[model samples]
Target: CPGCLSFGTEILTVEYGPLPIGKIVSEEINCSVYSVDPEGRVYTQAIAQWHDRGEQEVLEYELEDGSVIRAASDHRFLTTDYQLLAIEEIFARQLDLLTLENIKQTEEALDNHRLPFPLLDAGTIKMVKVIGRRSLGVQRIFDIGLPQDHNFLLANGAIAAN
Candidate 1:
């Protein structure tokens, strides 16, 4: 009864009633579970509750230490996972372009006209840090510190241009 609602034994004591047992019922309820490791790896699974039954779907990942992680959630879980992958892809591209040849060209482009990537000052770089992580309901929020001079938007309205 931990996740269920119950009513008194007898309220009106009617033989036939629409309320039945007075327990709240839903046609479809969605539940999600996420497991995130210290290395920032995430696993997710999702389940649906209907008519006292559960339908579960799990996505599993094996960790480096021979452990496993799982995350189960509704459609939002997939969306979040895809977004995280995209961010990693962007970081990969940035690293790929970090060669000295590209850096020299980028510097020249910045001085001559406009560069493709946003350049932050040395002071702004030092001010960026991760403050902490906090919980909001079932979700975890990472608190980040950024300098006021840092711009969060890109030319295409993207939040992270890395």
Candidate 2:
């Protein structure tokens, strides 16, 4: 699909622990992966399928600490303010084409950091930020299919959505 993650994107898997999206296919390993809930609880589910998303123009968003996510425009993510926003929305808000939904868990939004993002449903997850971003150009991206709740946790501590 158009909205997909970079090849090296780390997926939080159950059987093989944290595995890269490429490795899953490069190694042809079938396994289960993890997902998160609204209240920030971790859940495991079977991967309905994996995608060889091919080449795409990707945006790389760097988080407060050191986590960096490179994804196509269509992929969605859970931000600190609890908004299920897409990479497109992220840029739209950045460009003033859109606005924040607002939140109390996070008081104010900063230029460098946005809000206290859920660590990953890691519940272990609570706060984080997107420090900066740049174009990764067009690259091979990957994706996975989830059965129930079409969301999953990435090894980078991101709660990704369908």
Candidate 3:
């Protein structure tokens, strides 16, 4: 028996910019999908959201004459207009990106002046993985790139970091 073969590629376009600092005025999402090696299958989906200041409010935007048009929202920026309590409540129900222990450790490091920029950057980047596992159906624990200076050395022949 002979099976059909195919090869394909796609380019997704995510256009966003000219946005106000901390405010998501608008954006767009597009994607293409294909498979190679003939027998494989491929599918893709894209969704985008704009950050609404520090409010964590994802405001959907639309492209208008090469400009971003934001949807209406009661939240106000530059002032303590949004409700922190509400945000806290939302975060509470949401997935935990940073473990409570890790968060506390980061806070402790910051307080003790042991906070390494590279280590912090790794932790910050890992937060995205946590979010993906929760909301995006992503499942993987990838390595965190830490600075060489912070690399740890073990006593018994194993290597570790502090």
Candidate 4:
């Protein structure tokens, strides 16, 4: 089974204890089918910034999850998707002092100040790289932001830790 990350050739045994014939029973397998490493372990490190400027906060990262890793260090601002989107929505409207353009600029500024892989998502995020469009410019944000934080660069790669 090429597409199947794990499989049983036949039933292995007529009754492997309480196992069913074709069932792949596991929390990881049941949740995300396309993830290459379902049982993969993710190691996370937390980095906090601007404690004197504001209250300190922790940023967490895991390879199993997606966009947050990208957004945490500004690899990309992250689209209006998943939990990150929810967080964006909460603050998107609050900046009366800023315009959409100003908001984006400010976000980009903060993004550069953070470390990469600080945020975690449930899965990978797919985005295209383009130039000159504000919304389309998310990729640029990601590119400029990720390298600024060492934690982000290391965690964003394909590796696992016990």
Candidate 5:
């Protein structure tokens, strides 16, 4: 269940627009999915979601803005600094390195033209904090396939990784 997302999860489709992955599969659509390129442009690419991958563990990632992301632990996310990471992994690191307060402190440090660590290299993806996480236990999962980057935007509009 490496790159799989839960059944209740939704994604943007070119055909009927935003719909749950379960519903998207219910329809007979040879549609493309949304994914951003390195240039930070939103575009659609050929999609690959044949069927459900059966029951597996799913981790719920909650962003600071209340946007949610759910996927397997093996999957990674494109952070604002152009770093690729995951939910549990990020949770551990943020608990140690970056936190909700530290992000603001870093910004203040930037504003003062002083560097505590490094600057936020603005990328195509805006930065957001991972407020918390929870487990949804074992559930049906589906995987998305993108030919190029193998990446796409989840329903939360967060940069996704396969």
Candidate 6:
């Protein structure tokens, strides 16, 4: 099921210091799972690109110890590069973090600008819920369940759930 979104090869070009270095032929696959919480909030588990780097034509870099390496580099390097690209794409899409305060502010701003979508008009959020992706299982900071015994009143007049 994870490989269902697999895509075809694309030409990836790399450059270094104003010089064209190499081109890598690669394929990408994306897989995602979506869940709706009891509160009607949406959550997502996504794999942007289950990528496979195929054959690469690269410039050779000779080391001082007489070993040579590919200028285009390995999977680890490429994966980090792609992660940065992913962050850039998030910004390009103007995707903001969804919070109670942000939702309210966005509503007011949209009204001032005479924009259409109220975003949370139906009391549902389009943003993916934040969770720890590196953990073995789903981990979230916010516990949705309400229990009177677990509530803590802070000195600064803040209420926190334990």
Which candidate has the highest lDDT of all?
Answer: 2
- Residue pairs clashing, model 5: none
What TM-score should be assigned to candidate 6?
A: 0.16
Which residue ranges in model 3 land beyond 4 Å of their true spot?
1-101, 114-116, 121-162
lDDT of 2 at 147: 84
| Ten-residue stretch with the least lDDT total in model 6 | 12-21
Q: Global lDDT of each model?
A: 0.22, 0.63, 0.19, 0.20, 0.60, 0.22
For candidate 2, give the lDDT. 0.63
- Arranged by lDDT, best first: 2, 5, 6, 1, 4, 3
Q: What does candidate 6's lDDT look like per residue over 107-138, in tens digits?
A: 33443543233324423333321121111121
* Candidate 4: segments with Cα more than 4 A from true spot: 1-42, 51-122, 133-162
lDDT (C-alpha) at residue 43 in model 5:
52
TM-score of 3: 0.17
Which regions in candidate 5 have their CA more than 4 angstroms from the true location?
A: 26-28, 95-125
Question: 18-106 in candidate 4: lDDT tens per residue?
Answer: 12112423211121111112222122232222111111222222221231221222121223221112212322332111001222232
* RMSD (Å) per prediction: 21.4, 9.0, 20.9, 20.4, 9.1, 21.7
Per-model TM values vs. the true structure: 0.17, 0.73, 0.17, 0.16, 0.71, 0.16
**Model 1 lDDT tens row, 1-162:** 112111211111112211211221232223322222223232222322223223233333222223222222211111112232222232323211111112233233434543223333100111111112222223211111122211112111112211
- lDDT tens digits, residues 4-121, model 5? 7777776656555566766655563577765656654445677765566788888887777667777776667666555667666766666221112232332334345522223233
Error of 4 at 160 (Å): 19
Off by over 4 Å in 1: 1-112, 121-124, 139-162
In model 2, state the lDDT of residue 141: 78
lDDT of 2 at 102: 27
Clash count (model 6, backbone only) = 0
Q: Please report the TM-score between candidate 2 and the true structure.
A: 0.73
Q: Choose the strongest candidate by TM-score.
A: 2
